[PDB]
Amino acid sequence: NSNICEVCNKWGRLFCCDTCPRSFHEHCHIPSVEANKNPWSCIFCRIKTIQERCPESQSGHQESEVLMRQMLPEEQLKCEFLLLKVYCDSKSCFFASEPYYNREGSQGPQKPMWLNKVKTSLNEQMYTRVEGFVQDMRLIFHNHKEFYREDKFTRLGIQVQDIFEKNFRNIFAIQETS
């Protein structure tokens, strides 16, 4: 197995996947690395299994149909994985914890949102459809773009949204278009 966390790229107290060489800090993995379970298979492995059991799941889908899906176990897992792929980018640090807003010429968003809040919401089974998770994720970046206006820091929102959207299209097998 790797000697660094797959998500934050640091060493430390690492839990190793039994079916692939990745490793994780306990609370870097999503869901948090399970107490017992021998063998243990990481979320990467669990997602690859879904695909392998239903190869047709990789055919193109319309975003509108994906969003309306209820959060059954496989969709819960897919949203957990997509959230983890965003934490995998170091620029996620800016969006992880609860933000505050005091900038001359701007007013804070009406509905603040952040990664750790989305993480808690998934853990608590608060989303009933894929749409709820996706709307909170996109709200993170939209709030950022609106608040930072012409400051060049707006770009961090565009960058991390791009990581979210590429991973959304991959994980939920969105039909490719120009």
Ligand SMILES: [Zn+2]
């Ligand atoms: Zn880590």
Ligand SMILES: [Zn+2]
């Ligand atoms: Zn694995």
Ligand SMILES: [Zn+2]
């Ligand atoms: Zn099948």
